[PDB]
Every structure is written in C-alpha cells, then in structure tokens.
From a paper:
A stilbene O-methyltransferase, SbSOMT, is first shown to be indispensable for pathogen-inducible pterostilbene (3,5-bis-O-methylated) biosynthesis in sorghum (Sorghum bicolor). Phylogenetic analysis indicates the recruitment of genus-specific SOMTs from canonical caffeic acid O-methyltransferases (COMTs) after the divergence of Sorghum spp. from Saccharum spp. In recombinant enzyme assays, SbSOMT and COMTs regioselectively catalyze O-methylation of stilbene A-ring and B-ring respectively. Whilst SbSOMT shows global structural resemblance to SbCOMT, molecular characterizations illustrate two hydrophobic residues (Ile144/Phe337) crucial for substrate binding orientation leading to 3,5-bis-O-methylations in the A-ring. The catalytic residues of SbSOMT are highly conserved with all reported COMTs, including His282 as the key nucleophile, whereas Asp283, Glu310, and Glu342 collectively charge the basicity or confine His282 in its reactive conformation.
Residue numbers in the entry:
A (entry chain A): 15 to 377
B (entry chain B): 16 to 377
Amino acid sequence: SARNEEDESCMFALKLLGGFAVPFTIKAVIELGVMDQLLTAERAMSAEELVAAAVAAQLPRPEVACTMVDRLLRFLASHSVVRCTTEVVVGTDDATTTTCCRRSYAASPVCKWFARNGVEDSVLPLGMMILNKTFLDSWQNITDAVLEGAAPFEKTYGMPMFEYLSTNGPLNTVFHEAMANHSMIITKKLLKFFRGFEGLDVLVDVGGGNGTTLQMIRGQYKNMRGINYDLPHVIAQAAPVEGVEHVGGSMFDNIPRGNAVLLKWILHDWDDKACIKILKNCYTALHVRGKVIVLEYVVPDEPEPTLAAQGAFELDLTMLVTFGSGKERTQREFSELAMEAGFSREFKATYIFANVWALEFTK
Amino acid sequence: ARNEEDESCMFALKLLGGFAVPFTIKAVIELGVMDQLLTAERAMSAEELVAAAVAAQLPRPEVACTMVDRLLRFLASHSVVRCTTEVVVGTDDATTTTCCRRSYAASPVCKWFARNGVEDSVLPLGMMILNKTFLDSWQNITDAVLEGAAPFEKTYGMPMFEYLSTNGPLNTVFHEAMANHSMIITKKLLKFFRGFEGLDVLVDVGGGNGTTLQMIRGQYKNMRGINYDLPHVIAQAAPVEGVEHVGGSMFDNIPRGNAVLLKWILHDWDDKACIKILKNCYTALHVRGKVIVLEYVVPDEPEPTLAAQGAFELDLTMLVTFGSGKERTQREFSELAMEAGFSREFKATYIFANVWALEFTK
Ligand SMILES: NC(=O)c1ccc[n+]([C@@H]2O[C@H](COP(=O)([O-])OP(=O)(O)OC[C@H]3O[C@@H](n4cnc5c(N)ncnc54)[C@H](O)[C@@H]3O)[C@@H](O)[C@H]2O)c1
Ligand SMILES: NC(=O)c1ccc[n+]([C@@H]2O[C@H](COP(=O)([O-])OP(=O)(O)OC[C@H]3O[C@@H](n4cnc5c(N)ncnc54)[C@H](O)[C@@H]3O)[C@@H](O)[C@H]2O)c1
Ligand SMILES: COc1cc(O)cc(/C=C/c2ccc(O)cc2)c1
Ligand SMILES: COc1cc(O)cc(/C=C/c2ccc(O)cc2)c1
C-alpha cells in the first residue's frame, strides 16, 4: 500500500526492527490462558468471552483487561496467528477497542503448537525457554561479546550457561523441560519416519535424562536394549526402566559400548575440537559397522531465504548467543568431523521433522 | 516428515523467534558493520568489515570475525544483506565455513539504518524501539493486563513521561527518536501536504524547540507560528523568527490560531483525554480553523498487509507504553472530533511511513 519504493523501504526497515512484538504478544496471550480458550473453543469468541473463560480471579479493571486482550488478538490476527470476524453490536459496548463493532477470534492451525496440555504435541515448554527473560537478556549483549570473542550469555552473566544453571533452579527447570519437550516430539517423529533403529541390539543414548527416549524406542523395538548415559547427578535421579541400563559418566571421558550411539542436540553446543573428541569416544565404543546417529538441524551451504533455512540460522544465532562457539553445521561440516574421528566415507541423512535430520556415520 | 504438520510446527517456531532479526540488526549497527556495508564499493567479507569497523586491537580477532560472519549469514537468509560465496584459494579462519568465504553487501533497506548519510535514516527511532529499558516492559504484559495497567508502569512504578525525568540517558534516546521521526515527517509534509496554504497562524502543540514551525515557515514565509509546549521545554528553546514560544498544558488551554498541529499526541491518550484536548483545540480555533492530526490510521479490520501490521504493531507499543494510549481508525478519529464539536467534514492525506495528516474543521 506504500506510496512509492522509498515509503515501502522505510516501512520494511521499521518492520525488521519490530519483529519482537509478535513473540511477546503470543507469550502474553498464552500466559493469560486466552490461547488455551481459543484452542478448546467450539466457535469464535470475543475478547470478553475469552477473558471470562480464561481468568477465574476477580479483576480490578475488567473492561480495561478485555480491551487490552482485544488489541493483543487484533495484532495477532493481522499476522494470521488467529482468525478474526467482526460483527455490528446492537447496544453499547466496551470489551472491544472500536466504536460500532465486536471482534470475535478463533485459533489458526499454528496455535495448536502453543497448547498448555504440554504433551498434546505442543512446543510450549520449548517456547517458554525461547522467550524466557533471563535467556533473552543475553541478546542485548551481542555487540560487546563479539568484541571480546565471548558468548553473549557469558558476557551477560559472567560465566557459561551450563555452570550458571546450577545456581538458578527455576531457569534450570525451564531449560530441562524445553529439552525434554523437543526430545519427546522428535522421538515420536523418529518412530514414524526413521528406520535406523532396525537390527540394533544395543542403543546408547547420550544425555538420555530419565531414559524416556530409550523407553519409547523400546516400545517399538521390544528386543533392543538401551544404555541411558548421562551425568552422574542426572542418573542418580532416574527410576528403573525395563531394558535400559542407566550409566553415569562424562561423554568426554568415555561412552558405553553398543551397536549405535544417539547424539541429539549435543554436537551443536560445542566447537569442532570438542565434537571430534565426543565422536572419537563414540568410535572406540562402537563395534565395526556400528553407527552414530546425530539428531541436529543442518544449515544449507548458502543462506537461502526459506522458512526452513531461516529457522536453522536462527538456531545458529541461539547457539552463538548461548555458547559462542556452539554452532549449526552443514552436511559437509558434519561429515568432516566424523571422518576426523575415524568414521568411513559413508553418510546417511533422513529428514525427521521441525528441521531436524537424523545423520548416520558408520565405523 | 515434511507436510502441513511440519510447516505448522516450523511456523510456530518462526513466530516465537521473531526477536532474532531486530536483535541481530542492532548488533551489526552497534559494531559499526552496518556503516561499513553502507559506504562499501563492493561485497566485503566479515573479516574485511571487522577490520574496517573496529579501531582497537581485539583479544580474539578470528572469533570476532566468525561471529560477525554468522550474524551476517542470518541477515542474508532474511534478505537484509546480500551474500556471495567464493572458494578460498587455501583455508580460511575468519568465516564459519572453511572451504568457502562469504562476502556481503547492504540491501536497499539498510539505508534506513545509516549513522549519518546526508539522507533520511530511522536509526535514532530504531535505537528507541530496541532500547532495553523500553523492551523490558514487553515481558510484563500478562500481569499489567490482569491489573488493567500499562506494562511500562507495571515494570517501573510510574508513567513513562515521569520515568524520563529520572533517567537522563533514556530521556535523550526518547527525544532523539521523536526529533528524528518529526524531522522526516515534516519534510514529507512539505513535499506532499497542501493544508498549510492560507494559514495566518499555526499552533504546534508539543513543538519542542520550534524546529517544525521553523521548517514550515521556510516554505510559508507569511505564516506565523505558536510553539506551544510545557514551560520547561519552552525555557530551553532559542528564539525562532516568526514563532512565539508559549508555555502551558494542552489540558488547560491551547493558544488561538487558524490551525492546531497534533503529531503523535492523541495516540498517547485515552478517548476522554483526547476529547479534552480536542475541545481545547475547538475553542482555541477561529472559525473555519482546522486540527491537523499526524497519526497512523488503523484499518477497520485486521488486514495482513505490511502497512496494517505496522499500525497494529504501533498499537501494541502504545498499549505497552501508556496502556490506554492506542492507534485509531478513521471512524474513531472522526467520532472524537465530532464529540469535541468539529463538523462532519473530514480530510485524510497520506504522508509517509504509515503517517496520515487528518484534518477536522470548526
Ligand atoms: N572442550 C573440551 O574439550 C572439554 C570441555 C569440557 C570438558 N572436557 C573434559 O571432560 C572431563 C570432565 O570435566 P568436566 O566435569 O568439566 O566436564 P563434564 O563431564 O561436566 O562435561 C561438560 C559438559 O558436557 C556435557 N556432558 C558431559 N558428559 C555428558 C553426558 N554423559 N551426557 C550428556 N551431556 C554430557 C554437559 O553439558 C556438561 O556441562 C575432563 O577431562 C575435561 O577436560 C573437555
Ligand atoms: N489517558 C489517560 O490516562 C487519561 C484518561 C482520562 C483523562 N485524562 C486527562 O489527562 C490528565 C492527566 O495528565 P497530567 O495531569 O499528567 O498532565 P501533563 O500534561 O503534564 O502530562 C505530561 C504530558 O502532557 C503533554 N503536554 C501537556 N501540555 C503540553 C503542551 N502544551 N505541549 C506539549 N505537550 C504537552 C506532553 O505529552 C507531556 O509529556 C487527567 O488529569 C485528565 O485531564 C487522561
Ligand atoms: C514510547 O513512547 C512513544 C511515544 C510516541 O509518541 C510514539 C512512539 C512510537 C514508536 C514506534 C515504534 C515502532 C515503530 O515502527 C514506529 C514507531 C513511542
Ligand atoms: C539454551 O541452550 C540450548 C541448547 C540446546 O541444545 C538447544 C537449544 C535450542 C533452542 C531453540 C530456539 C529456538 C527454536 O526455534 C528452536 C530451538 C538451546
């Protein structure tokens, strides 16, 4: 609609500067309980009906709350996050932010990924880490961190993230729930789309937590045995799982022996030398023809302006912000690390879901 | 594995990640890399852009280059910069990818981030939009809504204009953003808007040091100006030929003239406060006088266009800053004017960057 190229140029610059407004608006609609009412609603609902349904608490300024929610949802409607219908009101009205007319709102399909059921296959626990204030604050310190060649997180909090989490119980839970949430989704998709668990006697899951992933995998492959390998303090908290041995240890020291080792979102935390050491421990732990299964995004060789590529470079920036030298890798960069660790010139890539690939390297 | 379910999920993650572009552009500006992009003659690698932007010896110069490379690659995937890739005659150590070296050029949009070309930039406004103090309020929307309060006030315990009195650096950031936007809009007004023709006296409510009036008089030499602003702002203004500085509150009175300019005033305020301002404009105006409202105009329905999204984005900015400040539709502006006494006579002239000049007539 801009009146010339100069005008459209200016508005695009403002748009680029303002991209934080959508995520922060979504967070509020979620936290208010409005997004869950949209998701269970049988028809479109006005801001007033959404607030009445979402809030049990008696509000001091209920009319202000309703118009504010109307403004939040109208903004998300402009971004196709929700559907909006407008009707004429016969009467007077003040639980909408316009003269004659009342908006009613329905969830778009994308909204199901924000569900608070948590495991209805939602990414909400991941989203709450993505938009966590403690983590977001690091993004304001990128400049100085680059100048020192440090992680923005380190430059913000004085120390690496994994150290800091030991000192912040609440942030630690947010982080672990996000990890667990993404793990659950990808594990399910793996059992739908990936065939590389066929023929395995023993699978070693590094960073397996309580061993949920191995348990779900054994649900489909009943004769496979699992080793759940994680830090001693994580293993101490792990209840028995049938067919899974919990083993405490550092992946930098050793990996337990097996037919395959699973690394999900491990390598992208670490620089190339650390990755090579992890893959060398995988290599010594495997019998010949054994495999490493890497569950990671793969960035394209060039910066393609696609939805998937943008999300992969967005994850690269998250890694820069969090760890500094943690990073997302191309297929070739993954191949090179594996060959450095001793693996053959034999590469498989199976696309799974949500930008995650299963890359398999073979001894 | 890639279907509608997959696209849906990626879309969800994209919506949650929208902050990454703005934060990355900020870093690239603040490192001085954007300015090197804007003066460059050709695509430059991260290494070249760092060497050119940074005076100091860095402790970890190769880490800094590879980090900038990653920032720029991300911006390339969003079409903010142009990237080309060439095979390294050897082995790099200042690009993230060893085979190959990326070089980058500014896209046209980057001119809007310039630190001082001789043209228009929105960089002072952008520094306000991405200022940490202001951004921190957006993390407090849920509790401010439940209380019916402005997120900003819930975050800092006072109204934004009161807070600026307590934070001189933020006060500068705010005023420079307003002055930047006002400068661009006043020049576009002199280009496109014809409603200053014929006016004896123009009253600029919130006119600061009188720069707007000074510029308009530069084109309309027989017009006189009344620069109306708070006494403390007027105390600081130097004399302006053909302009009288007057101190006061727009809630008490407006100086009389043929036209009153209200730029980004009404959107700070609720309907009751707007009606007070407009009733004061009405009584102040001589007959056939006009209020000239310089605001964004939100469409009647939430259209998914670049311009509409920009207007609802400013709406949420007003929500966050003031709570009850808000963007309006044409109909809502008309209705406030009619409540203040103005006639059923409405003009709208599109100016630039989503701003309209709306005129109401006594
Ligand atoms: N960059 C490196 O090469 C590097 C980094 C850290 C530790 N190490 C080596 O590791 C040994 C132990 O030192 P430490 O206790 O600081 O390191 P650690 O065992 O705590 O390892 C560091 C990080 O790696 C991850 N990790 C380690 N083992 C894991 C496992 N089984 N599952 C999931 N994640 C795991 C965790 O995120 C942890 O914070 C030392 O010999 C040390 O040199 C090497
Ligand atoms: N939106 C609302 O919060 C709301 C609601 C209903 C009524 N009101 C009315 O507004 C009053 C609150 O305002 P206040 O008492 O804090 O006063 P105030 O005028 O001192 O408020 C500060 C702001 O007023 C503006 N201002 C006032 N006169 C100006 C002038 N001549 N030139 C430029 N800018 C000028 C500036 O934007 C300044 O930052 C209420 O007492 C009532 O009259 C406001
Ligand atoms: C914080 O207080 C104020 C007061 C005011 O009068 C205007 C603004 C405008 C902000 C803005 C943000 C994003 C954009 O893309 C374009 C403008 C903010
Ligand atoms: C904070 O530390 C970590 C460690 C880790 O292994 C993964 C992530 C992933 C974040 C992320 C962000 C945005 C998305 O869209 C998708 C994932 C973050």
